[PDB]
Design a protein around this ligand. Structure first.
Ligand SMILES: NC(=O)c1ccc[n+]([C@@H]2O[C@H](COP(=O)(O)O)[C@@H](O)[C@H]2O)c1
Length: 182
């Protein structure tokens, strides 16, 4: 009845833009962004070096996100008199409760050098502290990729250095084939 797409990947790799571009070309499609479920700074912990622990599941209210997904599911049942949900976020594929929800999974990748450069041009709240990328972001990303070594479902890895349109066309082409097989 429904088709759920997961778009994860390294930080600042065009995940939200890809989700939005796909949505504009798919009927009855909604998007849920993991970034909307981060806990407030006051609830974030710090490591031995004083770095805020934002790049781990503990920094997110995943129970609240599951509730949001369940709400979409209920809405989807009344949207037709196929409903598509795209869930996008940097830490989705290591969350066990959702391991069986994915009908198709995409993962945006960008090498260390370029990822660091792009991250610096972006402003977060709170802003990245000095040395935050090498001290927390990248190490946690590597931990995430390590956890994914034992992933239990198929993931399509994407080159995040490709253009917005290139990525959209690539994923759309794949998605329509998957929808057809359903
Ligand atoms: N959303 C917030 O309120 C918030 C606050 C501080 C740091 N961050 C950063 O956002 C990143 C993930 O979001 P993106 O995948 O969009 O870059 C994480 O790597 C994290 O370090 C987000």
């Amino acid at each position: 009845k429904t088709f759920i797409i997961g778009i994860s990947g390294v930080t600042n790799s065009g995940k939200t833009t890809l989700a939005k571009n796909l949505q504009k070309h798919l009927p009855n499609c909604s998007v849920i962004s993991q970034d909307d479920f981060f806990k407030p700074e006051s609830e974030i912990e710090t490591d031995k070096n004083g770095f805020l622990q934002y790049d781990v599941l503990e920094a997110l209210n995943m129970e609240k996100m599951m509730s949001a997904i369940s709400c979409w599911m209920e809405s989807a049942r009344h949207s037709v008199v196929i409903p598509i949900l795209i869930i996008e976020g940097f830490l989705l594929f290591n969350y066990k409760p959702l391991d069986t929800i994915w009908n198709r999974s995409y993962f945006l990748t960008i090498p260390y050098e370029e990822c660091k450069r792009r991250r610096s041009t972006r402003v977060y709240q709170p802003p990245d502290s000095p040395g935050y990328f090498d001290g927390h972001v990248w190490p946690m990303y590597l931990k995430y990729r390590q956890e994914m070594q034992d992933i239990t479902w198929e993931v399509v890895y994407l080159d995040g250095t490709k253009s917005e349109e290139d990525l959209f066309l690539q994923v759309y082409e794949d998605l329509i084939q998957e929808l057809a097989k359903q």
